[PDB]
Amino acid sequence: VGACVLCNSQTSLRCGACIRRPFLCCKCCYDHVISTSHKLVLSVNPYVCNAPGCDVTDVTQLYLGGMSYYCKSHKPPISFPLCANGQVFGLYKNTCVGSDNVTDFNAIATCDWTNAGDYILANTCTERLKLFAAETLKATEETFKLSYGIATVREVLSDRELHLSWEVGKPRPPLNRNYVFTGYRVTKNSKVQIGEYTFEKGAVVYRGTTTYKLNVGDYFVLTSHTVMPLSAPTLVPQEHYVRITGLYPTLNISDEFSSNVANYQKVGMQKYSTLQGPPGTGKSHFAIGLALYYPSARIVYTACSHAAVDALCEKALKYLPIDKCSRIIPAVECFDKFKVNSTLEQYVFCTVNALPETTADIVVFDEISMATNYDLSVVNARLRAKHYVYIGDPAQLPAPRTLLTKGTLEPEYFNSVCRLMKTIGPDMFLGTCRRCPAEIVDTVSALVYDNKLKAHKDKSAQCFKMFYKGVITHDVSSAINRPQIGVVREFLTRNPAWRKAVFISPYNSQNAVASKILGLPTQTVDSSQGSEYDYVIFTQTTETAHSCNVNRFNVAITRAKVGILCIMSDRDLYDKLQFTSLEIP
Ligand SMILES: CC(C)(CO)NC(=O)c1cccc(Cl)c1
Numbered sequence: 327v328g329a330c331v332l333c334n335s336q337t338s339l340r341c342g343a344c345i346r347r348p349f350l351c352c353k354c355c356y357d358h359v360i361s362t363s364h365k366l367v368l369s370v371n372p373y374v375c376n377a378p379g380c381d382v383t384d385v386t387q388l389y390l391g392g393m394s395y396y397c398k399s400h401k402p403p404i405s406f407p408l409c410a411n412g413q414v415f416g417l418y419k420n421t422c423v424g425s426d427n428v429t430d431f432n433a434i435a436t437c438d439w440t441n442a443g444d445y446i447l448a449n450t451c452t453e454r455l456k457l458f459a460a461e462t463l464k465a466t467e468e469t470f471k472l473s474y475g476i477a478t479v480r481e482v483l484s485d486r487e488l489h490l491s492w493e494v495g496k497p498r499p500p501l502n503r504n505y506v507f508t509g510y511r512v513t514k515n516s517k518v519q520i521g522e523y524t525f526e527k528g529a530v531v532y533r534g535t536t537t538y539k540l541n542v543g544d545y546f547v548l549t550s551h552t553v554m555p556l557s558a559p560t561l562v563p564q565e566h567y568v569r570i571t572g573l574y575p576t577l578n579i580s581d582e583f584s585s586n587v588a589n590y591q592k593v594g595m596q597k598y599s600t601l602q603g604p605p606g607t608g609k610s611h612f613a614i615g616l617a618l619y620y621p622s623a624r625i626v627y628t629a630c631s632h633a634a635v636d637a638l639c640e641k642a643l644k645y646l647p648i649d650k651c652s653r654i655i656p657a658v659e660c661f662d663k664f665k666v667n668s669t670l671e672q673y674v675f676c677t678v679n680a681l682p683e684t685t686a687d688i689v690v691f692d693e694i695s696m697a698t699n700y701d702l703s704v705v706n707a708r709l710r711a712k713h714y715v716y717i718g719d720p721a722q723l724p725a726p727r728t729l730l731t732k733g734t735l736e737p738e739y740f741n742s743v744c745r746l747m748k749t750i751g752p753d754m755f756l757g758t759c760r761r762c763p764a765e766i767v768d769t770v771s772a773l774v775y776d777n778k779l780k781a782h783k784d785k786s787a788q789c790f791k792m793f794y795k796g797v798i799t800h801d802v803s804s805a806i807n808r809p810q811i812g813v814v815r816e817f818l819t820r821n822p823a824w825r826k827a828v829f830i831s832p833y834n835s836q837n838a839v840a841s842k843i844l845g846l847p848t849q850t851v852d853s854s855q856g857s858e859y860d861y862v863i864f865t866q867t868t869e870t871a872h873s874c875n876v877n878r879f880n881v882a883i884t885r886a887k888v889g890i891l892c893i894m895s896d897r898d899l900y901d902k903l904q905f906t907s908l909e910i911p
């Protein structure tokens with residue numbers, strides 16, 4: 327027994343064809359089965375033909391004959407159909423409202439999640455459908471991983487380099503850090519974990535969580551977890567207050583955090599507040615400073631990634647009593663300078679998926695662009711807070727959507743929070759970029775920030791751009807532009823200072839060919855988000871949707887504190903680069 331995701335109408339029916347098996351009310355369960363291919367229906371039992379060796383599952387072709395269900399061919403003489411009269415048969419057959427349109431829930435229930443429009447709907451549908459869609463997407467996502475073949479150690483060529491044999495009659499996953507494997511050791515009568523791993527083309531390079539002497543027979547699968555059901559909404563009901571509520575401001579604050587005193591007061595005067603923090607504007611400085619502004623407040627710092635949480639912990643280590651902080655870790659190496667798993671500690675740093683059930687004076691959810699509506703719902707379920715601050719930048723990168731191929735996901739569709747910031751604007755905005763040369767702040771202020779992002783630093787005069795299409799080669803899942811790496815080799819021989827630069831591209835395979843030919847450290851834009859470097863060399867590689875994504879580009883070029891070279895494929899963003907142009911050797 328449960329709740330009709332459309333009506334809430336109390337009901338004993340779940341769709342057996344929906345991977346999430348939602349509860350549907352007689353009305354909604356009927357409207358769902360007759361308007362889609364979904365015809366298997368689950369109650370306290372499954373509406374299937376309880377006849378010996380009959381394959382009728384379709385609820386529309388079944389009849390209750392006694393207390394046992396039958397199809398047309400096997401039914402007793404006295405039987406009523408299970409699915410007739412605009413209602414399918416179960417408990418609470420008198421309480422049932424329905425809907426004027428079921429169209430949205432059917433699309434959510436049946437879509438394969440390869441179309442942008444599926445994520446658009448999943449973020450514009452009603453709130454109860456946002457949860458249903460978030461479960462349905464995550465389950466489809468965790469299931470699709472199984473469709474990938476096992477990879478098995480055939481030969482250990484060296485250390486940090488392997489030879490994989492792949493399971494036949496299944497595809498192979500892309501070999502980039504968006505796909506994290508788990509190895510296994512062959513035992514008597516089962517298998518034990520041997521740390522998580524990532525792979526890249528040779529043979530294959532592997533960068534594993536723990537070190538080992540792993541040998542032939544050891545195999546690797548993308549570990550897929552059980553998706554729980556969602557209960558809490560993605561945003562609580564908003565409340566605007568006339569005073570600061572349940573928080574006691576400090577009388578004496580430091581000139582380090584004085585630029586955020588107004589914003590900290592705003593945080594105390596609504597239920598939840600959004601903070602758009604562009605690159606190097608001080609998101610973690612803001613987040614930690616909130617604590618010194620509300621000294622007595624209990625604050626739970628949360629984010630999706632361990633990395634994001636650890637950065638909050640690093641910044642905390644510089645400003646808050648260590649004794650009053652705790653890092654929550656479930657039984658991957660993360661921050662280990664606070665007492666571990668101390669829920670009742672005043673300052674709790676913890677990833678979303680590890681959050682305990684607890685209350686807090688304030689909740690800070692950082693790197694919000696990366697959150698999915700799944701995470702939003704989970705936080706609201708685990709954490710009851712007086713205030714919720716959502717810090718990120720809808721102009722930066724979202725969580726990768728492995729299943730998406732048709733259309734681009736716009737920042738208004740990343741999650742409920744990014745939706746507010748791109749529709750009604752953010753509550754709070756960090757308007758000064760302390761990190762980047764002015765050429766780069768001017769470029770992205772125009773590109774994605776409506777000219778409201780100001781440069782602290784002056785022009786570096788070390789920001790360069792070249793228009794070179796070069797020659798694009800494709801491997802199994804990635805792109806390579808060798809002449810663009812050529813041009814960078816030639817730039818480095820004329821400008822050897824730039825050999826302290828990080829290499830950035832939108833493709834791990836470009837990065838691999840760059841590492842070998844140049845010896846610069848490499849990042850993908852996506853792995854580069856949240857990091858800074860004095861000098862950045864960026865090769866666009868292609869003109870794709872992927873390599874022209876304005877949010878990727880915003881992250882690529884805001885990594886530089888001092889100078890950047892951008893080798894561009896796209897005439898569009900090349901022209902939007904307020905950089906010294908350079909001709910081709
Ligand atoms: C203006 C400078 C000295 C860079 O600061 N010129 C170059 O180094 C250059 C020019 C065109 C192409 C390549 Cl590969 C390098």
Ligand SMILES: [Zn+2]
Binds near residue numbers: 341343
């Ligand atoms: Zn269904």
Ligand SMILES: [Zn+2]
Binds near residue numbers: 330332350352
């Ligand atoms: Zn219903």
Ligand SMILES: [Zn+2]
Binds near residue numbers: 377382399
């Ligand atoms: Zn039958």
